[PDB]
Symmetry: C2
């Protein structure tokens, strides 16, 4: 009872849900004041980085993202790590369909790194992170990119790769030395 | 890679604006296919990781977050790096204020790491990342200020006590820079 839900108002329920939540929370002091916060909920998702130890490469994808297009990304094209919304599936089950559907690779074993909130300010979104190696034996609107891991790290510096989850995954592979 | 904006319908304009954008994009075969997508625009922001090579520590903050509380976070409490919305300000200007306001530390020189979309699937949000080493000399409620050893912060990522995207990204970056080695 340290935090109390006063009312969850639905501002929009088109496809995803935008809420206006009113709540009361205590303090280290002893008072209980209420706030009102707009909260957008598009469900949780999963993303995975595909890497190859043989040729020191990674598989990423490129696609048009309107949300970046109307906010600084001229062509709208964004290079990201394969990902998708859970849509009622378990994280791993979902990430396997996504890998197959977006990259064409039917991956084998995968490792779960963590689950992080990507924009806890006004978005509920929690993403499940995975990594997994791929092989050429596992192989329209989405362009599949295969490139050496070192070029992808540099692309973070040049700004060619400017997607949060993707940078997270890449810098993670870097400090794992699985490519070294 | 032809793309044409067809219409921009406002679904909500309470605090931040939620749009339903309809667009036409031409394919590799020449076919024009249209899509409709929700875009939540809450403005861009900036975040900063305050570190100290002297005592090998980092400064972070902790506060309640409704967005996570209604989505798996029992207490709603979240440990994150200092941050805030640009609100018409320049990244470096906004972030300097934030550090002072949220942590009480007035930082000197700051380095910009990069600009990243945190949830490009349906949010416009772009976050500017900064790192800056603090001093106990530069110090001048709803948010708890946490000063803890770097090695612990890093361990807290593995225990899941720290599960915020921008925070984990800044911690790992610091780890790779060798600025604490």
């Amino acid at each position: 009872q340290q935090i109390t839900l006063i009312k969850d108002k639905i501002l929009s329920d088109n496809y995803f849900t935008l809420h206006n939540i009113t709540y009361d929370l205590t303090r280290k002091d002893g008072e209980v004041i209420r706030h009102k916060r707009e909260v957008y909920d598009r469900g949780n998702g999963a993303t995975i980085l595909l890497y190859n130890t043989k040729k020191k490469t990674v598989v990423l994808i490129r696609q048009f993202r309107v949300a970046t297009w109307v906010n600084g990304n001229e062509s709208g094209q964004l290079i990201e790590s394969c990902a998708g919304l859970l849509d009622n599936d378990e994280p791993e089950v979902c990430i396997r369909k996504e890998a197959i559907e977006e990259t064409g690779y039917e991956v084998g074993e995968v490792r779960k790194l963590f689950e992080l909130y990507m924009s806890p300010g006004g978005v509920t979104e929690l993403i499940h992170f995975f990594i997994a190696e791929y092989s050429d034996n596992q192989r329209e609107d989405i362009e599949v990119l295969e490139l050496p891991f070192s070029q992808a790290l540099e692309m973070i510096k040049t700004g060619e790769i400017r997607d949060g989850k993707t940078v997270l995954l890449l810098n993670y592979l870097q400090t794992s030395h699985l490519m070294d």
